[PDB]
């Protein structure tokens, strides 16, 4: 199983973009799927996440503007980004997390290769 993101590019401040990630294996077993972003010279940060049962959460900075959704039947995760501004410029990564129900805690993580998003002012 591999995660492959598409949908990146340039947007004008105020504009919209939809990112997609296709997983090459089933995703039903992922406890959480989500989107991270990494801007120049900064640490990678959570943007949005969603459980298998469709409960979502968002970073304070994107609340209202971004919507994450998940289709276990299409093995896909999406990020609708509205009202973009230059502060949203970054490489965006899709993430998937799988956790045990027994034993010591751990997380098996999967990552896509990332897609560049550039917002013009």
């Amino acid at each position: 199983v591999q995660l492959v993101e598409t949908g990146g590019g340039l947007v004008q401040a105020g504009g919209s973009l939809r990112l997609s990630c296709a997983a090459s294996g089933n995703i039903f077993s992922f406890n959480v799927m989500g989107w991270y972003r990494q801007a120049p010279g900064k640490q990678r940060e959570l943007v949005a996440a969603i459980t298998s049962g469709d409960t979502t959460t968002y970073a304070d900075s994107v609340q209202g503007r971004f919507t994450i959704s998940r289709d276990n039947a299409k093995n896909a995760v999406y990020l609708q980004m509205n009202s973009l501004t230059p502060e949203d410029t970054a490489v965006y990564f899709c993430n998937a997390r799988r956790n045990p129900i027994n034993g010591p805690y751990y997380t098996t993580a999967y990552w896509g290769q990332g897609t560049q998003v550039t917002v013009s002012s």
Partner: peptide
């Protein structure tokens, strides 16, 4: 509540990982 529970969980786990 569930939204905030997920946010806290992922911020702690990702940072500590």
């Amino acid at each position: 509540s569930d939204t905030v529970k997920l946010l806290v969980d992922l911020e702690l786990s990702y940072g500590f990982e």
